[PDB]
RNA sequence: ACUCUGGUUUCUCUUCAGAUCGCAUAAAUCUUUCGCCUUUUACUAAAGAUUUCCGUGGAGAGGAACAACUCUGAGUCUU
RNA sequence: AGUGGGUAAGAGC
């Protein structure tokens, strides 16, 4: 059926403006040419997501020159930066490069983000603890639609209902999750057998790894 | 039956089904036939001959080609007979010793081009009359038993061993049927055909590696501890590259060295785990800088902890080796 | 390796031989590409310096410069040969082969100790250094 | 246009005039002459695949030879009917037997049975005009081995037999159940 | 000059023969080296983004 | 080693049966390979010759 | 009981090889365990991955053989 | 089983 209940839960429309890249190394009049021969240009390209796939952006690598050892934090917004033709994404392909922006098209009743975290290097697989800072209260993504959607769409804030928590390193760890009650409005953490009730106010305190988002 | 024909037919028995279970189907192939591109050239000619003349005909050739190869580097006091043994004319220098050393390979083949002189021997007196059939049947058979006594072909490839000793085990598999009623133990077998047939499939396989050599070696121009720096430098190298090529380096050649000193000071910081922030550089140059030293820090730690874990097996490493493990560690 | 200077034709390399009257010369053999070449030439960049005073460091590609390789036999990945006052200098490694150093080795400590007993042996007149460290064995364990 | 077989003394006479270095007909020719050195093993090879059995005395093979005397291949695959084949080397291990039975002291050829620095003798004054010996061969008998008595120790038994094969390349015999029997019967051993 | 004429025909001679299987296998390897660049790129490429915001 | 040492013998034993294989006579009439025909039939056990004679009538 | 049916051998070439290419059996390289262990070159013996080599079948193409009618079968082939 | 890992350098005649 083209809508089951998975896909009205879920799914949402989003839009991709892939764009071919000639080889770096080229000449600038060549590069030029091969952009203009009609190959190299932007094609759109719509879909259906059942999920937004978070990349978290470069660790610094060093240490803090004021305050050494300082755990990396990032805004919501600038991963949510993503999905509008503002920021592009040079996808480094084995073969070649290609310039892919996204678009969000259609919003889904609701919303399921996954920070990508366990990146496989070129040597092994490491997990990135960047941390994301997010207001659990609600966020507004009218902001990350195209005008000519943004006409059918009328409810665009997202209010955090279910956080996953990946904790320790890829070889070894401990997937906890935060769940809000709809009834009392608390949010409480439950691992294995052990549940406990935790603050909201701390629920950004840790490596989120799939968000639940409902838009009310 | 005694214990060795038993464990002569254990060894059989393993080695027939060694060559059974690694069956592998044979790979498609154009069809490119030997001896009939030879033919098309203008340089071979076809006949019929008598074998044993021609058997004489290749063993001069082969010695021919062998003296030809002995006095390569003009070097005369290499004596090699007409039954392919290789001795020094005289009481030759240490100087001259170490000047007049031939692989393994070299060896193989004076060994071999010795034993088909053998053969052909063996048929040469035969034709004589010095020998009957039968003599001939089974001096043929004690050559194809007795190679590594005769010759001692296995001193240049131990991998040979294989064929000697299935050829001995064929013995025993062969006389105590030959000899087992009126017929007592003696010098009196000819069936030759099981190591013949076992020293062709021997040739069979060992023909490509003295091609290839003397190929090599008769030409007109000769030709001839990487697991942790295979990586490193490399990819210092093409980072390296990548800046030259966009660095207008027409108009500034003289950084080359400025920025493989910034590589080189942000490798080192990372490694002593302290803040690292050219103030100066380029933020697309801190970029590169910062992606290059991600790279090198996943590869360091990758060979760190495989090296150690090849250590604490119990693995045959240098001392270098440790030292640089232990640092990184 | 690109660091070090690199010699393009036989001739120039004889005027680096002939024109180092006070330092030994050390060329490095072989191709640029080669990883055990790639080893060479990174242990002599990282004592490129260091030995400047009694040493000088010069890449030869064999590829492009042949001229060589019948008479050096450099046909071995990668070779090391030392010169004092345009004088081959051979060095008893415990190898077998005193003309060359045609294995890679890991630490430039040593690098620089054959390069020190060759500038030694080489000054006062001899033409065959003892290397300080045996070569015949690999010491793995 | 197509290349025939040379006369025998041809590469006879181009071997012989390839003695030595004394001769300096040939100093400079060279290149073409190692050129084809490289191909020794398969010379190699050819010969002992190829060397008679021992049910004859003269076994005339095909050869490439190069036109310098340098190689010179045995050019032939040692194809052999394989009933035929086993029934030969049953007959060989019944005569070798008998032999050894019989022969109380057996002369063992003694290796090698040639002087180190003698040269290889010429095929032309020690083995060409010699007649040869008498190879093993069975006594066939004339009742049992009626089919196979008239080509049993040919060099290939029915070689030219339209018959029995399809033709002098010397594949997919034919037989007849008579003479399978006899082989059968002659190869019990 | 029939000297430098037979090094070529016996070049020739060596590369048909070596024709046999020569097309296939530079095809598998060919695949296999696509195979490993599958999740190993090359170096210069994992730096191609960054060269080129150079 | 040219030979073969004794121990890497594979056909040692302990059980009789095993040690002692019931030699086939095939039907008195079959011949193993390489072992002549006299010494065969003057070492076979006859049990079928022995059937034989008391069934030839 | 008939008219047309058109050979088989052999030398090559070019592609495809599924199938025990092969009722037979090699070697090398690489990667894992190994056994020796002390450096290359030989190696120990199992697995895995390719490769070369001695061979093979089929198809297609081009010759010669060399004749040649026929074989054989489409059928009306007949008392 | 096996090759090696066993070249003193120097002076001109
Ligand atoms: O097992 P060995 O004692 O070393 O000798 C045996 C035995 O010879 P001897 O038992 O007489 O020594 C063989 O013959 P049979 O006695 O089994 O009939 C054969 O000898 P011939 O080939 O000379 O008949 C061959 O001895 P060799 O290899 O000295 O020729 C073989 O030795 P291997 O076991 O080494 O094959």
Request: net charge positive.
């Amino acid at each position: 059926k083209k809508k089951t209940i998975v896909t009205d839960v879920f799914q949402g429309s989003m839009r991709i403006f892939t764009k071919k890249l000639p080889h770096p190394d080229l000449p600038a009049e060549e590069k030029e040419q091969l952009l203009h021969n009609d190959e190299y240009q932007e094609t759109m390209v719509e879909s259906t997501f059942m999920y937004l796939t978070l990349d978290l952006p470069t660790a610094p690598l060093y240490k803090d020159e004021k305050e050494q050892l300082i755990i990396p934090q990032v805004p919501l917004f600038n991963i949510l930066a993503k999905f509008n033709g503002i920021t592009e994404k040079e996808y480094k392909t084995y073969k070649e490069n290609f310039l892919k922006r996204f678009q969000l098209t259609k919003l889904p009743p609701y919303l399921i983000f996954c920070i990508k975290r366990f990146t496989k290097n070129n040597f092994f697989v490491e997990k990135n603890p960047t941390i994301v800072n997010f207001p659990i209260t609600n966020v507004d993504l009218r902001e990350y639609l195209s005008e000519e959607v943004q006409a059918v769409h009328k409810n665009t804030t997202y209010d955090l209902i279910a956080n996953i928590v990946h904790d320790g390193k890829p070889s070894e760890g401990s997937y906890r999750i935060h769940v809000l009650h709809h009834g009392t409005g608390k949010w409480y953490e439950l691992q294995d057998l052990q549940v406990t009730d935790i603050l909201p106010q701390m629920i950004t305190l840790s490596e989120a790894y799939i968000q639940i988002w409902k838009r009310r | 039956q005694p214990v060795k024909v038993r464990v002569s037919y254990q060894k059989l028995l393993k080695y027939y089904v060694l060559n059974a279970l690694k069956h592998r189907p044979p790979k498609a192939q154009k069809k490119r036939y030997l001896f009939r591109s030879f033919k098309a050239t203008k340089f071979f000619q076809s006949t019929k001959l008598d074998w044993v003349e021609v058997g004489l005909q290749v063993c001069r050739q082969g010695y021919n080609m062998l003296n030809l190869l002995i006095h390569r580097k003009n070097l005369n006091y290499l004596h090699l007979d007409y039954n392919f043994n290789l001795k020094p004319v005289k009481t030759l220098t240490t100087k001259e010793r170490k000047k007049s050393r031939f692989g393994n390979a070299f060896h193989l083949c004076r060994e071999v081009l010795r034993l088909t002189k053998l053969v052909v021997d063996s048929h040469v007196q035969y034709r004589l009359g010095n020998v009957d059939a039968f003599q001939l049947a089974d001096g043929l058979q004690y050559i194809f038993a007795h190679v590594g006594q005769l010759t001692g072909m296995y001193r240049y490839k131990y991998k040979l061993m294989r064929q000697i000793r299935m050829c001995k085990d064929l013995k025993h598999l062969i006389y105590y049927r030959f000899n087992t009623g009126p017929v007592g133990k003696g010098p009196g077998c000819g069936f030759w055909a099981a190591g013949w047939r076992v020293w062709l499939f021997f040739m069979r396989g060992i023909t490509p590696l003295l091609e290839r050599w003397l190929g090599n070696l008769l030409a007109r121009q000769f030709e001839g501890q990487r697991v942790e720096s295979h990586f490193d430098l490399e990819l210092r190298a093409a980072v390296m590259h990548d800046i030259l090529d966009m660095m207008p380096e027409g108009i500034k050649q003289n950084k080359a060295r400025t920025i493989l000193q910034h590589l080189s000071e942000a490798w080192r910081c990372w490694k002593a785990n302290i803040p690292w922030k050219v103030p100066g550089l380029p933020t697309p140059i801190e970029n590169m800088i910062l992606r290059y030293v991600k790279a090198k820090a996943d590869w360091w730690t990758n060979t760190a902890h495989y090296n150690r874990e090849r250590i604490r097996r119990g693995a045959t490493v240098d001392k270098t080796v440790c030292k640089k493990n232990l640092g990184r560690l | 390796s690109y660091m070090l200077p690199h010699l393009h034709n036989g001739w120039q390399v004889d005027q680096a031989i002939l024109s180092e009257e006070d330092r030994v010369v050390v060329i490095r053999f072989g191709h640029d590409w080669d990883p055990t070449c790639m080893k060479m030439d990174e242990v002599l960049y990282s004592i490129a310096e260091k030995v400047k005073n009694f040493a000088v460091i010069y890449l030869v590609d064999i590829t492009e410069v042949p001229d060589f390789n019948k008479m050096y036999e450099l046909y071995d990945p990668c070779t090391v040969m030392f010169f004092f006052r345009n004088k081959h200098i051979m060095i008893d490694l415990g190898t077998g082969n005193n003309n060359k150093i045609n294995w890679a080795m890991e630490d430039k400590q040593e690098m620089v100790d054959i390069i020190e007993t060759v500038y030694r042996g080489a000054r006062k007149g001899r033409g065959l250094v003892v290397s300080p460290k045996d070569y015949s064995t690999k010491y793995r364990y | 246009a197509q290349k025939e077989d040379m006369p025998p003394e041809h590469v006879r006479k181009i071997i012989r005039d390839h003695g030595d270095m004394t001769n300096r007909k040939f100093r400079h020719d060279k290149r073409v002459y190692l050129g084809a050195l490289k191909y020794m093993p398969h010379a190699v090879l050819k010969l002992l695949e190829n060397m008679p059995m021992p049910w004859e005395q003269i076994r005339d093979v095909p050869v490439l030879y190069h036109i310098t005397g340098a190689i010179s291949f045995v050019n032939e695959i040692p194809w052999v009917i394989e009933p035929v084949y086993i029934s030969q080397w049953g007959s060989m291990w019944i005569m070798m037997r008998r032999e050894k039975r019989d022969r109380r002291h057996f002369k063992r050829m003694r290796f090698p049975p040639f002087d180190d620095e003698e040269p290889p003798l010429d095929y032309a004054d020690n083995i060409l005009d010699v007649e040869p010996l008498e190879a093993i061969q069975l006594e066939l008998d004339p009742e049992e081995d009626a089919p196979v008595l008239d080509w049993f120790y040919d060099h290939q038994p029915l070689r030219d037999s339209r018959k029995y094969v399809n033709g002098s390349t010397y594949q997919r015999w034919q037989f007849t159940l008579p003479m399978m029997s006899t082989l059968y019967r002659l190869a019990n051993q | 000059k029939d000297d430098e004429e037979a090094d070529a025909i016996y070049a020739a001679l060596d590369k048909r023969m070596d024709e046999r299987r020569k097309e296939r296998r530079e095809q598998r390897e060919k695949e296999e080296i696509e195979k490993y660049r599958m999740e190993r790129p090359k170096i210069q490429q994992q730096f191609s983004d960054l060269k080129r915001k150079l | 080693v040219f030979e073969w040492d004794a121990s890497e013998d594979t056909s040692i034993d302990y059980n009789p049966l095993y040690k002692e294989r019931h030699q086939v006579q095939l039907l008195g009439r079959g011949f193993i390979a390489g072992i002549d025909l006299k010494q065969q039939k003057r070492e076979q056990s006859r049990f079928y010759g022995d059937l034989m004679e008391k069934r030839r009538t």
